[PDB]
Symmetry: C2
Subunit: 942 residues, 2 copies
């Protein structure tokens, strides 16, 4: 081929969105270079085919035929298995390149204050939100709080970001580094004062990096063990966050000086923390064994030690001073047991104790045992801090605090942020697995069946045991495999250091018994320092009952003694939305938070909420700013935890500057809310929300639960069946086979509908609710409009729906139907699509927008440039599903299209992603590729 | 405690040199930050004091009024000892910061082709010289060479840069990195698209970095050991050159692209190489022992291994491909049949990552390589096998080239030509020792050995034999098959040192060494003596022998000696068509003045090349200290182009002096430019020689040489009281007694300047800003020429404009005068010279003024450096700090020399080692000496 992809992108976007907008030129730059590398490696006919694919798909977005995708499907059908994998591979790489360009454009975009319109709506986009200094200034200047009050608030604030597995692709450090080199070359190529020779060489470097990324095929490395999954998960901490935290904390120092506070934020401030679910969450995942949990704790300790060893070595090089404390001098010469460099000999000792600490962990991991003594290593953060604080005090004593406030201060901030394990591990298990244990205990003792007892009979008995001083768990207790897994986990918790763990989380929590049950089990299995117990209220019924549950827990003397004035509660968004639709789930959650908070205030407990997957707070790219500000008043008060989904971890943390802005907005929003809460809801707002909720729930359950043919439609129109059967997703897709959607799990629910571009779980029920309110009273349309403009809760909830509609396409969802759904159920499909378009139309009306995402052109531009690649994979997926499912459906087989090489074990190559494949060679790898790429393009939805 | 230094700079130079010139802004920025740190650490009155002396000195340069030097000295008089050391060190740091700012300005100055006037004079300044593509284009389009002729020339070219010890300064890696952080914050602060908080934080970083550099200072108690000096010199290799040459070599690839050659320069071309004298040069330096040589060779191998381990590790991160050729796959499979004590890649490496399996084996063999050397250094033995290690560079290259060709076999040559190509070019540049070591020793120390064994065997006395009897006997032994050196031989400590050195050469790998250089070489006997001693001490792979000729008489006879060696059958068989010879500039200039040395050198090169061409020998010249080629900052370009025709032809060796290493290699960009001009000038000269000298030019040079030598010798040799004046008017006496140069200053006690050495000769006179060795004799020569004929004034002007040799010869003199100051030289006289000798000093200053005025007249300049405002600006803004140290030096010298001197108690003005001199004096004098040397850099 000859011509560039520039033209087909221009016709997708209505112009430049800012006058430093070079995104389309970036996209064209990288993919034009990719296609040339593709042509030189595999021949012009292959490169021409891939580019034609892209053009058909880009043109469909320009105006949605559907006729053109079917003939695209016709050509992709009948490619040989090797050519299908190569095409799918190339389109995925192009999509990755587009995302890299977008990161570069966001990172170096010149701030433009003229875009701000004032008010809370500005905090929904990165282009208009307020940095840490602007929010500090607003607090002192508009809210009227003292700089001293702001300084004190920051000192008592902690934001805790919780990392979770990616649903389709791990990221190794190697590739993150290949990503950074592609980004760096693109930035440097666009410098103003560029020489021709530098440009020629930077061009050759860019082509080189793109080809290296294309010939590693990280795409086709077959899904890793849970330990590897955790190791690759830490890559972003290694590559951006580790150096990011000290950089941002230094900007906080800058900001408070700029409001009159002339001292730095003390280095012992846990302003930001990081936690992990990888190796800890075992809810419905038996691959996560007690040994896996021990393994990830030891791995974390190794990686920490390595990062510290290198920081300390760079620090030794810098601190060549000779003037020092008396106390530092006595210790320096003690360790001489070059001497004129006292900071160097202290830090060299720390480095060796760090090597011991890492080797000890490596041995415990390999052998279960290590003769390397705990004496020889660092066993506490206190023992690690002592030498570093000695050096800080010494350098200040001799008048060089300026030096100490360089990288030594950075290192101290890193120790108080990451500790010795980088992240703390959350443990999670479902409530009935605990009931199974206790029921085995009660019947073995002949006490009865805890399963059959009332909720209050349970409470009465468990409180009798907890107040009692006599053990309970028999050592000869007959255990099943599941019961042994729960007991074994607790034994692993007992054997490991307390600072390795965060909370123990109870999935499907319903009643105070679920919490007290694990308190008992923790003690009875020998956890001498118990973990805090955290309920996860998922269903609507449980959210309704949640404030009562926690009030009865707070009414118990024993429990108040144990929790010492602090309680954590986790709330689920996608969980609750799967129960009774999103809109009702959102409103029930707001109220549950509201009521839990005053229950908490009444008993004098500090309540912390942990926001699970699917939350508006989870949109870490920018909208999280407004989403946090929109939380009910007095719900945060300096302490909050948020799930960082894998599908957005690259967008938030892949790039140095974006990592900075992600950390910044979480800390700013959280700080401001505690001193500047949102408007309290009006009565007519509540009343309308209440009535809308019943209509939305009834509409959601009428289609999802009460319609017999729904499940059969679901497994035809989506790749849900193949997602499960294939080698992706790590987990069993549902709890028991064949109980409908009830036993299906949140991730497959959202994943399967997002792949088809339909997004049913996010919006269903909302159209009925809006229509019901408009029809009930003509004045209700104006009150919903006012709610969207005046009530942050209502704005962020529909802003999410708008974004997911921007990511949807009824034509493509209909193509899945046309190909894969039985004739008798196609009318049901088009009725769901009728609900889709009716919901979108009224959502736009209430927001006052003419077309989707009017008012966020930046987000609109970023999404639309992905669709050419996503749509290509959508057509590929649909036709691959029909041939997978229908054994003698074919069309014309085509002669091979790519060129290279008689070297290669061609058959073994079609099957990299799952060599034990039970599907015909090439189909499983082609379907996984479409799934990976569609997931990469869609990122966060519901 | 208030006002900025900005103003006092602006009146030294009133105005920009180019529209991009922010040097004065840069100076002011860093120095104002330093003074504020100074006031915060020691109080306002000390800060104000140091700023005041800066101001007095700055105004002296503005209009040279002798009076305020004395009052400045009166002010430095009253400081308590601790306060004097503080003031001296602060002035020194301010000079360092000024040099850092100058590096940044040179590095990021936008080139401006409007200032090029065409012709060879453009290649004398960095502001107008040619980059490597420009000279490639000139060679093809103007000279008329074919691109393939150029490509072939580059493939056969090598430039060999030789690092030498700094005469007065350490350079630790820690400080080189602090320097880099200061430069980076300075550049980033001047980006215009910068947010105010970014600005605020980069400012805080800059201050933090300036302070850390200030409070790492301390002592010069014990002079540095040769091992330390060697560590000092490798720091620039670590920090800049290591990654420098792969990046430059990539630039010549693109230059070849742009003249039609669509190949990269093959990775086996050692276009650039680096050598060392530290631990190898023992000439008049008994501190440099056989075991010191063993030690520096092993240290070099250790650091080499460390740099490679890091490059291999990051290459492991990049090469994650799974496709490879059959040969690589079977090898990778093998090594999976046997990784824990590393940080990266501690887990076993999967076999589906073939390049990582091979490179992880390379890393483990490098670890063994390093540990073996560490053990040999600590204990003389190592149980770590040579088989476990890399013992040759061929063994190291095999795994690397296996990956290169596998990558290309599978269509990934583009990937291969990334970092792997960089690593290959590094192996073919640095090898396994980073640098090759030159050995040097003086010729009479070899004659002493041979006389010891001729007498012991009863043959007679080799010392008393004539040059012909020596040759006849040496070659009878060299052709013979029977050993000579008795193990029973009675040896003095000096004889044992020469013998022991050869034994160390015999027990180390050949790749570690360069040539064996003979100081004070005079006759072919000196060369053949070391060839015999090399064999008779058991050096199975002998080093090439290199004569250093030094004196005028020796340069005259050099072509005759070369021819005699070339007509000997045994020697032609040994050198196999290649010979290297070393020439000294400071050396020869000390003998008979600078101008005669320069002209004798041109003629000696000329004639030696004609001899070498006749016998079919490839002659490589090694340019010693003091050469015009030694101005690595820019003038090297022209100075190399100015060499006699067919003197280089792809092969040259240049001394990199310590005083200039920081200016040419401290900063990433300037090291690129240093490497580039050495490569471009050398290449072009071989295909585009300079104009042949006219007859009248030759004759005028002949006449002027006689007059210059006569008046140089008339003052430094034939004037009885000169020695006495010299040890009064310079700190030479204190330089030696305090062991500043680490080496004895004279070869023999007594004998005048002839037995004095070149370093102290140039150093002593550069400290006083007089520079007598560089210019003396040329004023008389110029005046003689113009006076004997009408026409000679025009002929000299034409020579300056048309003859590169003459241009570079006088451009050096002009630069040194810009660095000189008769007022300051006269205050050294007024304080320390006896009354009866001060008229003699005033006559020497008269010949300074007469020399400078006529040099300007022949150059057609009215003021000094009129044609190089860039360099003139760079130098004058150093003078305020050097001049302050000058007056501090002069007054501390009289205090030190006075036996009756004690210390008057004085109150401290600041808030806050066991030397044998009165308190403060020793460390104060060392500080002035180090600072003045840092400010003057290279002169003669």
């Amino acid at each position: 081929k000859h011509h560039s992809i520039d033209a087909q992108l221009r016709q997708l976007v209505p112009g430049k969105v800012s006058e430093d907008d070079k995104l389309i030129e970036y996209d064209a730059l990288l993919v034009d270079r990719f296609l040339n590398i593709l042509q030189d490696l595999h021949g012009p006919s292959l490169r021409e085919f891939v580019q034609e694919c892209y053009e058909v798909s880009a043109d469909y977005e320009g105006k949605g035929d559907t006729t053109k995708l079917g003939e695209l499907g016709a050509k992709l059908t009948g490619l040989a298995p090797a050519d299908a994998i190569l095409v799918a591979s190339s389109i995925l790489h192009m999509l990755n390149l587009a995302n890299l360009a977008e990161e570069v454009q966001i990172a170096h975009r010149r701030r433009n204050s003229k875009l701000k319109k004032g008010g809370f709506a500005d905090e929904g986009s990165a282009t208009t939100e307020s940095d840490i200094e602007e929010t500090l200034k607003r607090l002192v200047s508009e809210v009227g709080k003292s700089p001293e009050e702001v300084f004190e608030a920051l000192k008592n604030q902690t934001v805790d970001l919780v990392f979770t597995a990616h649903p389709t692709q791990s990221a190794r450090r190697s590739l993150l580094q290949k990503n950074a080199r592609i980004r760096n070359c693109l930035t440097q190529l666009n410098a103003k004062d560029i020489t021709d020779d530098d440009k020629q060489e930077l061009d050759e470097a860019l082509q080189r990096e793109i080809q290296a990324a294309f010939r590693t095929d990280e795409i086709r490395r077959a899904q890793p063990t849970p330990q590897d999954e955790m190791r690759y998960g830490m890559s972003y901490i290694h590559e951006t966050v580790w150096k990011g935290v000290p950089k941002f904390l230094r900007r906080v120092d800058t900001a408070l000086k700029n409001i009159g506070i002339n001292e730095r934020l003390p280095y012992n401030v846990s302003l930001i923390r990081f936690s992990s679910w990888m190796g800890g969450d075992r809810d419905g995942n038996p691959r996560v064994t007690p040994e896996v949990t021990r393994d990830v704790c030891l791995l974390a300790r190794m990686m920490a030690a390595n990062l510290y060893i290198d920081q300390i070595e760079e620090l030794m090089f810098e601190l060549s001073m000779w003037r020092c404390n008396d106390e530092l001098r006595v210790r320096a010469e003690e360790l001489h047991s070059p001497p004129n460099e006292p900071y160097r000999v202290i830090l060299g000792h720390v480095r060796d104790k760090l090597y011991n600490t890492r080797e000890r962990a490596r041995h415990l991991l390999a052998s279960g045992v290590s003769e390397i003594s705990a004496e020889s290593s660092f066993t506490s953060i206190e023992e690690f801090l002592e030498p570093l604080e000695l050096c800080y005090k010494s350098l200040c004593d001799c008048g060089d605090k300026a030096i100490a406030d360089g990288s030594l201060l950075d290192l101290l901030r890193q120790v108080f942020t990451f500790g010795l394990s980088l992240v703390k591990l959350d443990i999670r298990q479902e409530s009935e697995r605990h009931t199974d244990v206790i029921d085995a205990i009660t019947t073995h003792l002949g006490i009865g069946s805890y399963r059959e007892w009332s909720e209050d009979k349970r409470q009465e008995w468990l409180l009798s045991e907890l107040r009692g001083k006599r053990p309970l768990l028999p050592p000869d207790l007959p255990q099943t495999e599941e019961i042994a897994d729960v007991i074994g986990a607790f034994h692993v918790l007992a054997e490991l250091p307390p600072d390795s763990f965060g909370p123990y989380i109870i999935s499907m929590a319903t009643a105070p018994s679920d919490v007290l049950a694990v308190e008992l089990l923790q003690r009875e299995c020998g956890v001498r320092q118990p973990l805090p117990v955290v309920p996860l209220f998922e269903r609507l019924a449980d959210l309704q009952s949640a404030p009562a549950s926690v009030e009865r827990l707070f009414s118990v003397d024993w429990y108040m003694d144990r929790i010492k004035g602090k309680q954590q509660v986790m709330v689920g968004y996608s969980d609750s939305g799967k129960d009774a639709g999103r809109l009702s789930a959102a409103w029930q959650l707001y109220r549950a938070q509201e009521e839990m908070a005053q229950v908490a205030k009444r008993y004098g407990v500090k309540l912390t909420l942990f926001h699970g997957r699917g939350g508006t707070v989870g949109r870490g790219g920018g909208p999280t700013h407004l989403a946090i500000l929109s939380q009910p008043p007095d719900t945060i008060n300096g302490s909050i935890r948020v799930t960082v989904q894998g599908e957005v971890i690259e967008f938030c943390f892949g790039e140095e500057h974006l990592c900075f802005q992600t950390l910044q907005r979480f800390t700013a929003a959280t700080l401001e809310h505690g001193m500047h809460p949102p408007v309290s809801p009006k009565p007519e707002w509540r009343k309308l929300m209440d009535e809308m909720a019943v209509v939305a729930t009834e509409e959601y359950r009428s289609v999802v639960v009460k319609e017999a043919r729904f499940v059969e439609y679901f497994r035809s129109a989506t790749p849900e069946t193949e997602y499960g059967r294939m080698n992706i997703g790590s987990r069993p897709a549902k709890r028991r086979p064949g109980g409908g959607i009830t036993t299906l799990r949140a991730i497959p629910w959202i994943f399967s509908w997002t792949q088809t571009r339909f997004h049913l779980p996010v919006w269903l029920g909302v159209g009925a609710a809006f229509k019901f309110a408009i029809d009930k009273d003509v004045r209700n349309f104006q009150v919903l409009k006012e709610m969207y403009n005046e009530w942050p809760f209502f704005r962020v909830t529909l802003d999410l729906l708008e974004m997911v509609f921007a990511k949807g396409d009824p034509g493509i969802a209909g193509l899945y139907d046309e190909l894969l759904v039985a004739e008798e159920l196609k009318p049901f499909g088009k009725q769901l699509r009728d609900k889709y378009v009716e919901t979108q139309q009224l959502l736009l009306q209430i927001a006052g927008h003419k077309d989707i995402l009017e008012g966020d052109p930046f987000l609109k531009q970023g999404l639309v440039l992905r669709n050419p690649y996503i749509t290509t994979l959508n057509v590929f997926q649909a036709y691959t599903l029909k041939r997978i499912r229908d054994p003698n459906f074919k069309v014309t087989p085509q002669p091979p299209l790519s060129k290279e090489f008689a070297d290669e074990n061609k058959p073994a190559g079609l099957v990299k992603l799952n060599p034990a494949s039970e599907y015909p060679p090439g189909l499983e790898d082609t379907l996984i590729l479409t799934m990976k790429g569609i997931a990469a393009g869609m990122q966060n939805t519901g």
